[PDB]
Amino acid sequence: ANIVGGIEYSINNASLCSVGFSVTRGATKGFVTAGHCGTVNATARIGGAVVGTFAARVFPGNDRAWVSLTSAQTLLPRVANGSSFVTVRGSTEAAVGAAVCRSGRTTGYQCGTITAKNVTANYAEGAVRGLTQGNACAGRGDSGGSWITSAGQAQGVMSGLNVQSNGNNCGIPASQRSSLFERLQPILSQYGLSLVTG
């Protein structure tokens, strides 16, 4: 499969999450995603075929994971935006007020602004701290997906949101949305990963 940020993959033939970013760890290919999406050694599939397994994760506390891929996978420096693509150029962290977009398999590509950093989400499993909040909308299934600026700077991966009864927070004004993502930089340094860029 071609590994592009934002696309669907399943975990052990049951949950769905979205690909965050293509990365490498030495000769190993992988992608970063959300920790709550799978446990270590869970099987990741893209379009019915096995692409790799969860190599490491931390959830709750943090919400991060990376999946090591078989070498048949093609890592691409891109994030899906409809039929188009946003090229990944690096991971400079944007400040509050900066505009940002996110990509995932439920709601597609959505944009908004970073509204706060170092937010704690209190999920049923336990607290996840240190998250950044934006007001781009998102829905169940978008977890693990790319948050990136239009300029191509990778910000992080989707963690959670104030989901409404329709499965997303796209039907409430931006002012009322809390969509939270896990910062990319601590994930890259914790697993010694390098981002694929173009």
Partner: peptide, 4 residues
């Protein structure tokens, strides 16, 4: 907020 809930995971996703």
């Amino acid at each position: 907020a809930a995971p996703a």
